[model samples]
Target: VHRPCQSVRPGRVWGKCCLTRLCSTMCCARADCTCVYHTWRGHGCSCVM
Candidate 1:
């Protein structure tokens, strides 16, 4: 949240594979949090609650 941006939880090929729920987590919602973005397909991603 401070310093340069970094991915907290990286992408998983499938949403289930991502145990941390980064696939469902939102990167934008994070105020001081960096996006735990993960790839859904070729160039898509999602986050969790």
Candidate 2:
């Protein structure tokens, strides 16, 4: 389930918190992220790491 979230596109908005419901990678490994507009899109979570 730990899909590499290192390819998030530019301008794509994703939710905050390292403990994402989709991101299975180690939260500690992920730096940090934030979301304001985009929420759950019925697909895997996307954020910066």
Candidate 3:
């Protein structure tokens, strides 16, 4: 499964950006999942399983 998650905080800079742990905790529940940053649009997470 692939899940795309974004930070609630809005800003131009990367300050207080979303984190991998946060994505993994919120989007992915299983240990097989992986979370990575997606910075094109904004601070985001790409959860992969």
Candidate 4:
């Protein structure tokens, strides 16, 4: 069975959050993923959650 986490492909967004690691942002295509279009602390835009 496919787990919930399996539904989202990781590595699409990277950043330093509360702990610092690969973070998950909006759920959309890579092109549509604004996180990839923007820039953050030496990484992609954070989820800011």
Candidate 5:
């Protein structure tokens, strides 16, 4: 859980989303997880539904 809540595991790519206090961008993932990356916000990224 870095400043942007990017990496699920260590040494991984920091993804883009996750609502505040959520599973750290777990919700921001696209179908089939094609778009795992999300746009980081102040607290967290705007989770795309």
Candidate 6:
């Protein structure tokens, strides 16, 4: 069985966040996932399972 999962990245500069997006995408590719970005939080990816 699969469970909900999430991945998070460190805060980055505006331009570097693009790379963070890629990291989120790749990290969450195994399940139904979404990517999110925040100025302080940087990048995050969540999988719904």
Task: Name the candidate that leads on lDDT.
Answer: 6
Cα error, residue 27 of model 5, in Å, equals: 5.8
lDDT of 2 by residue, 1-49 (tens): 3433454567877534444433343343233442333356432433564
Tens digit of per-residue lDDT, candidate 3, span 1-49: 2334455568644333223345533534444545565667434344454
Q: What does the lDDT read for residue 15 in candidate 2? A: 36
The digit string of per-residue lDDT tens for model 6 on 1-49 reads 4333443445633222232224443555434566777679778675555
- Give residue 33's error in model 3 in angstroms: 0.9
Pairs of colliding residues, candidate 1? 11-38, 24-47, 24-48, 25-47, 25-48
The superposed Cα distance between candidate 4 and the true structure at residue 29, in angstroms, equals 4.2
Kindly indicate the candidate among 2 and 3 with the higher TM-score: 3
Q: Give the per-residue lDDT of model 4 (tens digit) for 1-49.
A: 2212332345755333222333354343333233544445433643444
RMSD of each: 12.8, 11.7, 10.6, 11.7, 10.9, 12.3
| Candidate 1, position 5, lDDT | 35
Model 3 vs truth, CA RMSD: 10.6
lDDT of 1 at 16: 27
Better of 1 and 3 by lDDT: 3
Could you give me the TM-score of model 6 versus the true structure? 0.32
List candidate 3 segments past 4 Å from native.
1-25, 41-49
The predicted structure with the larger TM-score, 3 or 5, is: 3
Q: Identify the runs in model 4 with alpha carbons over 4 angstroms from their true place.
A: 1-23, 29-37, 40-49
For candidate 2, the C-alpha RMSD (Å) to the true structure equals 11.7
**Where's the lowest-lDDT run of ten residues in candidate 1?**
14-23
Winner on TM-score between 5 and 6 is 6
TM-score of model number 3: 0.26
What's the true lDDT of residue 6 in model 1? 39
What TM-scores do the predictions have? 0.18, 0.17, 0.26, 0.17, 0.21, 0.32
